[PDB]
Amino acid sequence: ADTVTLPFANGERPLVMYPGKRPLIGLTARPPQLETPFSVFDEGLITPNDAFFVRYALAGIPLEIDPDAFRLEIKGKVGTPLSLSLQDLKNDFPASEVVAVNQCSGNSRGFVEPRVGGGQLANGAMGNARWRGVPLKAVLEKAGVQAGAKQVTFGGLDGPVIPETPDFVKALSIDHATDGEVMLAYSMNGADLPWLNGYPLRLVVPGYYGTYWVKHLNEITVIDKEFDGFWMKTAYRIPDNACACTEPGKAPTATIPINRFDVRSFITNVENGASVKAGEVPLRGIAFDGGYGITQVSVSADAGKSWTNATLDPGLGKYSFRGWKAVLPLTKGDHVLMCRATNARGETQPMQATWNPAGYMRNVVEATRVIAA
Amino acid sequence: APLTYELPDETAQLKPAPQPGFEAAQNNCAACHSVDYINTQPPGKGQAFWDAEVQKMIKVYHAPVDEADAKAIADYLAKTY
Ligand code: HEC
Ligand code: MSS
């Protein structure tokens, strides 16, 4: 039936409908991987549950869950091992909330040049939601972390089809896990987690790439060494340098795990070749970073020759999409519109795209050609 | 009762080709994941790309593919995609 075409080579995808979801861009069926149509980001600041993107590494996702039998296990280098029900979590601990962007490591990989292998995503593998749950800090304090603790590993209900394939397990440093922001989220936008977004419980790691946000989370292990599981040691690595980048075609000499978002911004109310009325053209869109706050968003209508200051919306917190609005004088004819954001620690977007072998962390200044009449 | 989730039908198929690697890819490349993983890769990447993809499936994810089939699959893919 319905298809879309993403604007890169071999960009054709089916529009697919999953239970509880609107039609989305189908990347893969087994495991399910769904990208959000770009138009959704112009609908409002919080991404709806039924539009939220889905990424999974392994096909053995859970398809039947009894929320009453479900237990989160807390173990390893702790005083008291814990076995917690969802009712335990909701009753015995105080709740927190955070509005936070979840974005895949590989968001926008389809735009990387030269093209690289992996999930060929446009910019729709990101979303912003109100998350509610228990700060991991409080669960870990109850277990009683031992001095000696270095890292916390996180595992979920999903599993590899073939037992030899490495099971999806991630790690955070102990001081990160106990920071008060890392959350055990049982709620997304005031509802239970959509199935494919990790029902009944997921890790939320504000300002960090999505790979850490472990879904169907059932196993937390405090360890006193570095975790050398495959999804930390081999997968999700970036070049160990300031641009997280190498010369096109070159492998890095040193790598580190992907960590915190770089600064991004988009224009959401217009897309390539849109018609606008010559004169005062109203633009709007979004910006986000790794939790330092957006300081400003500049807009350009002459492909980056000159810049206008956008007006920032009232914010929903440092981890949320930050909205912005601008009105630009446009003469009749062609214009290449750009936006560029900078954050409170002075990070900004490069004008020219960088590259790495994985196609991770793209944040180049986005250009949108419009026609003013 | 538990809650359950109903996935829609899987419809992704490999492009048919006369090469023997087509059949071999059908028998080896759909066991862990759908083949839309292959269909959606960047186009015209060539021999080295697909050789590396196939080898990674075998060495890292432990796909039970033998050497003759690995070559056949990689050649089919580099020629077809
Ligand atoms: C289980 C042992 C596998 C078999 C059999 C094959 N592959 Fe696979 N593949 C496997 C995993 C765990 C993943 C990661 C999926 C994710 O969502 O991260 C993949 C992915 C791919 C891809 C996507 C690009 C990439 O990550 O490298 C491609 C193009 C791919 N696989 C191709 C492929 C082929 C050609 C196979 C037959 C030799 C094959 N896969 C079998 C695991 C497994
Ligand atoms: N359990 C689990 N979890 C998990 C997984 C898997 O596979 N599994 N994935 C990741 C990723 S990788 Mo890349 O970096 S992004 C991502 C995220 C997403 O989310 P959503 O799906 O909800 O959206 O998730 C996360 N989590």
Q: How far apart are CA B40 and CA B23, in angstroms?
A: 19
The total of structural domains in chain B comes to 1
Q: How far apart are CA A112 and CA A358, in angstroms?
A: 10
Q: Write down the H helix ranges in A60-156.
A: 86-92, 136-143
Residues A131 and A71 reside in one and the same domain: yes
Judge: B42–A9 Cβ closer than 8 Å, yes or no: yes
Which domain CATH number covers A219?
A: 3.90.420.10
Judge: A115–B2 Cβ closer than 8 Å, yes or no: no
B7 within a domain of the structure (yes/no): no
- Of A209, A241, A259, which closes a domain? A259
Tokens representing A225 are 């060494």
* CA dist list (Å): A126 to A26, A40, A60, A82: 15, 11, 23, 33
| DSSP type of residue A216 | S
B30 within a domain of the structure (yes/no): yes
3-state SS string for A238-302: EECCCCCCCCCCCCCCCEEECCECCCEEEECCCCCCEEECCEEEEEEEEEECCCCCEEEEEEECC
Which domain CATH number covers B54?
A: 1.10.760.10
- Minimal-distance CA residue to ligand 1 atom 2: B63
Judge: B42–A28 Cβ closer than 8 Å, yes or no: no
Asked if residue A356 lies in contact with residue A244, where contact means CB atoms within 8 angstroms, the answer is: yes
Asked if residue B32 lies in contact with residue A162, where contact means CB atoms within 8 angstroms, the answer is: yes
SS3 A176: helix
The atom number, within ligand 1, closest to the CA of A161 reads 1
Judge: A9–B41 Cβ closer than 8 Å, yes or no: no
**Closest CA of chain A from B79, distance in Å:** 15
Judge: B7–A29 Cβ closer than 8 Å, yes or no: yes
Residues A94 and A153 reside in one and the same domain: yes
Residue A297 — φ and ψ, nearest 5°? -130, 125
From the list A88, A325, A57, the residue with the least C-alpha distance to A215 is A57
Name which of A30, A66, A195 is nearest B10 (Cβ-Cβ): A30
Residues A198 and A100 reside in one and the same domain: yes
Asked if residue A25 lies in contact with residue A34, where contact means CB atoms within 8 angstroms, the answer is: yes
Tokens representing A161 are 């089809």
Name which of B33, B42, B43 is nearest A31 (Cβ-Cβ): B33
Ligand 2 pocket, residue A53 CB under 6 Å = yes
Domain extent at residue B29: 19-81
Judge: A117–B53 Cβ closer than 8 Å, yes or no: yes
Asked if residue A186 lies in contact with residue A171, where contact means CB atoms within 8 angstroms, the answer is: no
**Closest CA of chain B from A29, distance in Å:** 6
Q: In this structure, how many other beta carbons lie within 10 angstroms of the beta carbon of residue A11? A: 15
Q: Contacts of residue A234 in chain B, CB cutoff 8 Å? A: 60
Residues A199 and A274 reside in one and the same domain: no
Burial of B77 (0-12, 13-18, 19+ CB in 10 A): buried
Name which of B3, B8, B60 is nearest A65 (Cβ-Cβ): B3
Judge: A29–B31 Cβ closer than 8 Å, yes or no: no
Q: How far apart are CA A99 and CA A125, in angstroms?
A: 17
Residues A91 and A206 reside in one and the same domain: yes
Q: How many CA atoms lie within 13 A of A353 on its CB side?
A: 17
Asked if residue A262 lies in contact with residue A353, where contact means CB atoms within 8 angstroms, the answer is: no
Residues A243 and A265 reside in one and the same domain: no
Which domain CATH number covers A271?
A: 2.60.40.650
Bridge-based pairing of strands A264-267 and A217-223 is unpaired
Residues A248 and A338 reside in one and the same domain: no
B59 within a domain of the structure (yes/no): yes
Whole-number Å distance, alpha carbon A303 to ligand 2 midpoint, is: 35
Asked if residue A343 lies in contact with residue A293, where contact means CB atoms within 8 angstroms, the answer is: yes
Residue for token digits 């890169």? A8
Q: How far apart are CA B15 and CA A88, in angstroms?
A: 51
Question: How many beta-carbon contacts under 8 Å exist across A and B?
Answer: 87
Helices B47-59 and B67-80 pack at an angle, to 10 degrees, of 140
Name which of B10, B33, B40 is nearest A120 (Cβ-Cβ): B40
B12 within a domain of the structure (yes/no): no
> What helix, strand, coil percent values describe chain A, rounded to 5?
10, 40, 50
Burial A334-361 (b: 16+ CB within 10 A, else e): ebebbbbbbbeeebbbeeeebbbbbbbb
- Of A259, A292, A319, which closes a domain? A259
Tokens representing B9 are 């039908």
B55 within a domain of the structure (yes/no): yes
Residue-level length of chain A: 373
- Of A210, A234, A259, which closes a domain? A259
Whole-number Å distance, alpha carbon A233 to ligand 2 midpoint, is: 17
From the list A92, A132, A100, A111, the residue with the least C-alpha distance to A352 is A111
Asked if residue A271 lies in contact with residue A42, where contact means CB atoms within 8 angstroms, the answer is: no
The total of structural domains in chain A comes to 2
Residue-level length of chain B: 81
Q: In this structure, how many other beta carbons lie within 10 angstroms of the beta carbon of residue A306? A: 10
- Minimal-distance CA residue to ligand 1 atom 26: A118
Q: What is the largest CA-CA distance in chain B?
A: 51
From the list A293, A329, A328, A323, the residue with the least C-alpha distance to A311 is A323
* CA dist list (Å): A97 to A135, A181, A184, A189, A261: 9, 9, 10, 10, 20
Method of determination?
X-ray
Whole-number Å distance, alpha carbon B49 to ligand 2 midpoint, is: 25
Residue B68 — φ and ψ, nearest 5°? -65, -40
Q: How far apart are CA A224 and CA A238, in angstroms?
A: 24
One-character DSSP codes across B20-70 = HHHHHHHHHSSSSS-THHHHTSPTT--HHHHHHHHHHHHHTS-----HHHH
The atom number, within ligand 2, closest to the CA of A217 reads 1
B14 within a domain of the structure (yes/no): no
Q: Which of B39, B53, B67, B81 to mutate to test the pocket of ligand 1 (most atoms within 8 A of CB)?
A: B53
Q: How far apart are CA A227 and CA A85, in angstroms?
A: 26
Rounded to a whole number of angstroms, the distance between the first and last alpha carbons of chain B is 45
* CA dist list (Å): A318 to A97, A101, A128, A325: 13, 10, 12, 18
Q: Is B5 annotated as a binding residue?
A: no
Ligand nearest to the CA of A237: 2
Whole-number Å distance, alpha carbon A47 to ligand 1 midpoint, is: 30
Asked if residue A290 lies in contact with residue A260, where contact means CB atoms within 8 angstroms, the answer is: yes
Residues A238 and A277 reside in one and the same domain: no
Q: Contacts of residue A161 in chain B, CB cutoff 8 Å? A: 31-32
Q: Is A55 annotated as a binding residue?
A: yes
Tokens representing A298 are 């500049």
Helices B20-28 and B67-80 pack at an angle, to 10 degrees, of 110
Residues A253 and A271 reside in one and the same domain: no
Residue A128 — φ and ψ, nearest 5°? -125, 125
Q: In this structure, how many other beta carbons lie within 10 angstroms of the beta carbon of residue A270? A: 19
Domain extent at residue A293: 260-373
Q: Is B76 annotated as a binding residue?
A: no
Ligand 2 pocket, residue A205 CB under 6 Å = no
B27 touches A at CB < 8 Å: no
Residues A193 and A84 reside in one and the same domain: yes
